[PDB]
Scaffold this motif. Structure first.
Motif, PDB file in Angstrom:
ATOM      1  N   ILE A  40       1.416   4.906  -1.268  1.00 52.18           N
ATOM      2  CA  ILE A  40       0.615   4.162  -2.224  1.00 52.18           C
ATOM      3  C   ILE A  40      -0.568   3.518  -1.527  1.00 52.18           C
ATOM      4  O   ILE A  40      -0.422   2.906  -0.465  1.00 52.18           O
ATOM      5  N   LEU A  41      -1.739   3.652  -2.133  1.00 51.34           N
ATOM      6  CA  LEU A  41      -2.924   2.909  -1.745  1.00 51.34           C
ATOM      7  C   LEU A  41      -3.428   2.200  -2.987  1.00 51.34           C
ATOM      8  O   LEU A  41      -3.590   2.833  -4.030  1.00 51.34           O
ATOM      9  N   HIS A  42      -3.651   0.890  -2.873  1.00 51.14           N
ATOM     10  CA  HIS A  42      -4.201   0.068  -3.955  1.00 51.14           C
ATOM     11  C   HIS A  42      -3.387   0.174  -5.236  1.00 51.14           C
ATOM     12  O   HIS A  42      -3.922   0.049  -6.336  1.00 51.14           O
ATOM     13  N   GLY A  43      -2.089   0.409  -5.113  1.00 52.48           N
ATOM     14  CA  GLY A  43      -1.243   0.512  -6.277  1.00 52.48           C
ATOM     15  C   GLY A  43      -1.168   1.880  -6.918  1.00 52.48           C
ATOM     16  O   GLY A  43      -0.480   2.027  -7.933  1.00 52.48           O
ATOM     17  N   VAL A  44      -1.837   2.887  -6.365  1.00 54.18           N
ATOM     18  CA  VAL A  44      -1.795   4.237  -6.913  1.00 54.18           C
ATOM     19  C   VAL A  44      -1.410   5.208  -5.805  1.00 54.18           C
ATOM     20  O   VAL A  44      -1.807   5.037  -4.650  1.00 54.18           O
ATOM     21  N   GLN A  45      -0.585   6.193  -6.145  1.00 57.80           N
ATOM     22  CA  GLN A  45      -0.104   7.150  -5.161  1.00 57.80           C
ATOM     23  C   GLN A  45      -1.227   8.079  -4.732  1.00 57.80           C
ATOM     24  O   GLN A  45      -1.944   8.627  -5.571  1.00 57.80           O
ATOM     25  N   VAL A  46      -1.384   8.253  -3.423  1.00 57.16           N
ATOM     26  CA  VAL A  46      -2.444   9.098  -2.890  1.00 57.16           C
ATOM     27  C   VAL A  46      -1.862  10.100  -1.912  1.00 57.16           C
ATOM     28  O   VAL A  46      -2.598  10.828  -1.242  1.00 57.16           O
TER      29      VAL A  46
ATOM     30  N   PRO B  61       1.564   3.054  13.973  1.00 55.82           N
ATOM     31  CA  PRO B  61       2.821   2.326  13.829  1.00 55.82           C
ATOM     32  C   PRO B  61       3.093   2.007  12.373  1.00 55.82           C
ATOM     33  O   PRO B  61       2.189   1.943  11.541  1.00 55.82           O
ATOM     34  N   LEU B  62       4.367   1.806  12.070  1.00 55.43           N
ATOM     35  CA  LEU B  62       4.802   1.417  10.740  1.00 55.43           C
ATOM     36  C   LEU B  62       5.323  -0.010  10.786  1.00 55.43           C
ATOM     37  O   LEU B  62       6.250  -0.309  11.542  1.00 55.43           O
ATOM     38  N   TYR B  63       4.736  -0.882   9.975  1.00 55.34           N
ATOM     39  CA  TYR B  63       5.064  -2.300   9.980  1.00 55.34           C
ATOM     40  C   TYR B  63       6.082  -2.605   8.897  1.00 55.34           C
ATOM     41  O   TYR B  63       5.965  -2.114   7.772  1.00 55.34           O
ATOM     42  N   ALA B  64       7.074  -3.425   9.240  1.00 60.61           N
ATOM     43  CA  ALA B  64       8.200  -3.668   8.352  1.00 60.61           C
ATOM     44  C   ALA B  64       7.843  -4.509   7.140  1.00 60.61           C
ATOM     45  O   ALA B  64       8.575  -4.467   6.149  1.00 60.61           O
ATOM     46  N   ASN B  65       6.756  -5.266   7.187  1.00 58.33           N
ATOM     47  CA  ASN B  65       6.343  -6.059   6.041  1.00 58.33           C
ATOM     48  C   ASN B  65       4.856  -6.327   6.162  1.00 58.33           C
ATOM     49  O   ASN B  65       4.224  -5.990   7.164  1.00 58.33           O
TER      50      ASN B  65
ATOM     51  N   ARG C  77       3.012   1.536   1.559  1.00 58.26           N
ATOM     52  CA  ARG C  77       1.723   1.008   1.163  1.00 58.26           C
ATOM     53  C   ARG C  77       0.726   1.193   2.293  1.00 58.26           C
ATOM     54  O   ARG C  77       1.069   1.089   3.470  1.00 58.26           O
ATOM     55  N   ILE C  78      -0.515   1.480   1.927  1.00 58.38           N
ATOM     56  CA  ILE C  78      -1.596   1.621   2.887  1.00 58.38           C
ATOM     57  C   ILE C  78      -2.551   0.454   2.725  1.00 58.38           C
ATOM     58  O   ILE C  78      -3.018   0.168   1.619  1.00 58.38           O
ATOM     59  N   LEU C  79      -2.836  -0.226   3.829  1.00 54.17           N
ATOM     60  CA  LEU C  79      -3.923  -1.191   3.889  1.00 54.17           C
ATOM     61  C   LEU C  79      -5.106  -0.487   4.520  1.00 54.17           C
ATOM     62  O   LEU C  79      -5.125  -0.277   5.741  1.00 54.17           O
ATOM     63  N   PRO C  80      -6.097  -0.079   3.740  1.00 53.18           N
ATOM     64  CA  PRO C  80      -7.202   0.696   4.299  1.00 53.18           C
ATOM     65  C   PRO C  80      -8.076  -0.151   5.199  1.00 53.18           C
ATOM     66  O   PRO C  80      -8.156  -1.374   5.075  1.00 53.18           O
TER      67      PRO C  80
ATOM     68  N   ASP D  12      -9.157   3.701  10.514  1.00 54.01           N
ATOM     69  CA  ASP D  12      -8.372   2.493  10.653  1.00 54.01           C
ATOM     70  C   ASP D  12      -7.649   2.260   9.344  1.00 54.01           C
ATOM     71  O   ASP D  12      -8.236   2.423   8.273  1.00 54.01           O
ATOM     72  N   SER D  13      -6.384   1.892   9.444  1.00 57.73           N
ATOM     73  CA  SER D  13      -5.568   1.493   8.309  1.00 57.73           C
ATOM     74  C   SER D  13      -4.278   0.947   8.882  1.00 57.73           C
ATOM     75  O   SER D  13      -4.041   1.004  10.092  1.00 57.73           O
ATOM     76  N   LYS D  14      -3.443   0.416   8.010  1.00 61.04           N
ATOM     77  CA  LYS D  14      -2.120  -0.011   8.405  1.00 61.04           C
ATOM     78  C   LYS D  14      -1.130   0.491   7.373  1.00 61.04           C
ATOM     79  O   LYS D  14      -1.445   0.616   6.192  1.00 61.04           O
TER      80      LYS D  14
END
Lengths: 357, 357
Positions: free
Chosen positions: A5-11, A89-93, A75-78, A41-43
């Motif tokens: 999910i990015l911004h609440g929509v599946q991408v 890396p994958l962050y737990a929260n 979730r993606i934080l762009p 860059d993203s998380k």
């Protein structure tokens, strides 16, 4: 099979999941139409696990909504710009993603040595001028003393310096005055376990050379007790104690560091420390007299008294002055012993000694 | 049919479950491709039961997630190296697996005997220099007194020694001062039931030989009241009490252990204890006088007074000195009776007795 999910929509979608020795590695795919929105860059934040946190003001429900928790996903934080590196890396929260803290144990920004302090085991905030900076992560035993590990944020790691000195305050502290009292605006761990404050001084680099690690002081004043150290030899301890102020013309210029008997038992040695600013005040011919308690007067024809809600009554002030004279005796050297006067010099208010600075 | 999870991914399965006399025994299987990741040491933790724990900072949900709780299963905490031994214990939760505590009742690391103390029934922490070490597991009655069982961690079982002495502090204690007051940074069981502290001394091995078990002292000072014990014979008890300090030149060197009448009723025997460091101060010709309360002065032509927020006013200090003389009378033996002087010797500030050490 989880979404992505990015911004609440599946991408995108999680392709597969492979277990390795160090842990799990996922492979995920992004659709071409949304490919240009990640930008190097993203998380990546886990959304498959609900996490309700409770705060005094912090009511929050992180990780998922209920409709989105059954689907799960990542979730993606762009970000803005980048390179599309191979691994992420994958962050737990969300919070650890913001902190850029992929691990669980924060690094020890600084270590302190303190013998006996009723402080936090882990979690109280660090304060610079009562501004929240870092946190305590570990207290561990050692043969010498405690060993306390502090992690602070990289944004504030410029604030700590060679002149940084640390003092502990434990539990909930309330300050009382004559007009009214206040409670400290304590956060959680301050209320529970007690924060640690620190500040930078001028000569505190000399405080760092002594001792291999910075020592966590038991009080704010004990951290600040730096400067000239002298001894006064009183025939009895009387009403003095540790932290008792030293008064020049009614102004506090130093404290009593500690006191004990001499190597002979006839006298009592009282270690004092005068702050650096007033260090030039003490001269070799200076006179020290006890000023503890309320010293009223009485006359047969008329009695006149004095009361001033003395801190000296609370903690017996030692006063000092300097007799006048054109050839000034120089500044007292470190450890210069003195003798306590039982009474005031009668002309100490009349003495004029125009000391420099 | 339950799965068997390592690092969040299934790597095996529970084959079957057999009930024995002592309890359940499971047989489980691991796939060959994941066989090399267990490596002889590991721990097996139950994941089929949810367990929400609440803490002041400890918000935690252990055992399972909701998606994983319907599946159930056993989590594996892998180790580094080992042998693949035949059997492995199954730990009911993550914390007991970390503690390596397969049982439910921790072993009694030490036992204490105390008659009447308002302490924890089970669960308050043990503190070494106010550093958290262990816990209280049991209080049980006995004909002599209580019997209190303490378990501490094996990592800190070096800290306890023959010179370890234990004192209890109960409930929530707040410390007041002239400038402000603080609350103890109490954990849960300290706030509820009150912790137990302990520390190592020098001569406290002599404190262990007396009594078959270590005695839990009611206060920190009562634990520390070790050294020379003497008696002073006052005609009345006056303002004294247990814990009242003994003052040499205004410095506390000992306390009043207790007081009672003599076997005859004419005098009052006051047991005192002087600490070891100052034990050489007491000589056979030493003079003891009461120093309780604020002793002002008055003259017909002028009155001069003294106030020093005396602890002696709060707890009436007994002062002592030694008259000067070249042949020093030796140190007072244990139980040497003395006589209280109603007034100060007038030259006690002028006496010079250069005692060694």
């Amino acid at each position: 099979g989880q979404p992505l999910i990015l911004h609440g929509v599946q991408v995108g979608q999680v392709i597969d999941r492979k277990l390795t020795s160090k842990g799990v590695t996922f492979t995920v795919a992004i659709e071409p139409q949304h490919r240009e929105l990640v930008k190097g860059d993203s998380k990546f934040v886990v959304n498959s696990r609900v996490d309700v946190k409770v705060g005094l003001d912090g009511v929050e429900f992180l990780g998922a909504s209920a409709s989105e928790w059954i689907n799960g996903g990542i979730r993606i934080l762009p970000g803005d710009k980048g390179e599309m590196k191979a691994s992420y890396p994958l962050y737990a929260n969300l919070e650890k993603a913001l902190e850029n803290s992929l691990s669980d144990l924060p690094t020890t920004t600084v270590s302190l040595s303190a013998e006996t302090l009723p402080d936090v085991q882990a979690g109280s905030v660090v304060l610079y001028r009562k501004f929240e900076v870092g946190e305590v992560i570990t207290v561990r035993p050692r043969a010498n003393a405690f060993d306390i590990d502090l992690h602070i944020k990289p944004e504030y790691r410029n604030l700590l310096t060679s002149n940084s000195v640390f003092w502990a305050e434990g539990g909930a502290k309330v300050q009382l005055n004559g007009s009214g009292l206040t409670v400290q605006a304590s956060p959680l761990s301050r209320a529970l376990k007690g924060a640690i404050s620190f500040d930078n001084l001028s000569g505190a680099s000399a405080s760092q050379r002594k001792g291999d690690k910075r020592i966590l002081y038991a009080s704010e004043t004990a951290a600040r007790a730096v400067g000239l150290s002298i001894i006064v030899e009183a025939p009895e301890a009387g009403s003095l104690g540790i932290g008792t102020p030293v008064l020049f013309r009614g102004l506090e210029v130093g404290t009593v560091t500690g006191m004990t008997l001499g190597t002979l038992s006839d006298r009592v040695m009282i270690a004092m420390r005068i702050s650096k600013r007033y260090q030039h005040l003490v001269r070799n011919n200076s006179v020290f007299w006890l000023a503890s308690g309320y010293s009223l007067d009485f006359g047969l024809t008329g009695g006149v008294v004095k009361t001033g809600t003395f801190n000296q009554f609370i903690r017996g002030g030692i006063a000092f002055a300097t007799p006048p004279g054109t050839p000034l005796a120089p500044k007292a050297q470190e450890g210069k012993h003195f003798l306590l006067q039982e009474s005031e010099p009668k002309e100490w208010r009349e003495w004029g000694t125009a000391l420099p600075k």
